[PDB]
Design a protein around this ligand. Sequence first.
Ligand code: CL
Ligand code: CL
Ligand code: CL
Ligand code: CL
Ligand code: CL
Ligand code: MG
Length: 204
Amino acid sequence: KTAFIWDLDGTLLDSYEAILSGIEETFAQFSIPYDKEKVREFIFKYSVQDLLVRVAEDRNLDVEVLNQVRAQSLAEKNAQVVLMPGAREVLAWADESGIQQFIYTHKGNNAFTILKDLGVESYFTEILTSQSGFVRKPSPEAATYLLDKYQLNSDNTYYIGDRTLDVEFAQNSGIQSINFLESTYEGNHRIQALADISRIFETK
Ligand SMILES: [Cl-]
Ligand SMILES: [Cl-]
Ligand SMILES: [Cl-]
Ligand SMILES: [Cl-]
Ligand SMILES: [Cl-]
Ligand SMILES: [Mg+2]
């Protein structure tokens, strides 16, 4: 019957302070001045990779070295990662309901460590990270793999996320979407909170 494929950051995981701490440590190693608010505003308007790019271009540093120190430092801040509100409750609900649960994340293998630290790793049948080999969302290949392997029903398979690229991933792979954002995609179901998800699966 039903399958959820989950995003992590902003959906299940609140990695905000861990990411900022990771960036602060990385900036200290390269002698880059660190202002939390300016970093906060940049990564919200753009992305963490764009921030690395900006300082690499501006300060003549090697972006890949920046990114490897970033990944490394981020992995040291796992203690600062907190679940999003309602995340434990929806995971438990889905599990009890017999919904099969998966992850596709742009995070690396450290995603496994975090989920184990938070006590939620055992919910997932398979966890796909940036080490999986698949092209980043919204490229569909990761989802197609899960459909093919687990014999999932595209009408009852939902990618759950918080960004437009998460809706696109669902659309590109022919599956349904549950998302904080509105979309013109017919298979999107907009939520205001994680607690709304269970309400999708009962009469109105
Ligand atoms: Cl993520
Ligand atoms: Cl990051
Ligand atoms: Cl666990
Ligand atoms: Cl890629
Ligand atoms: Cl991705
Ligand atoms: Mg997200």
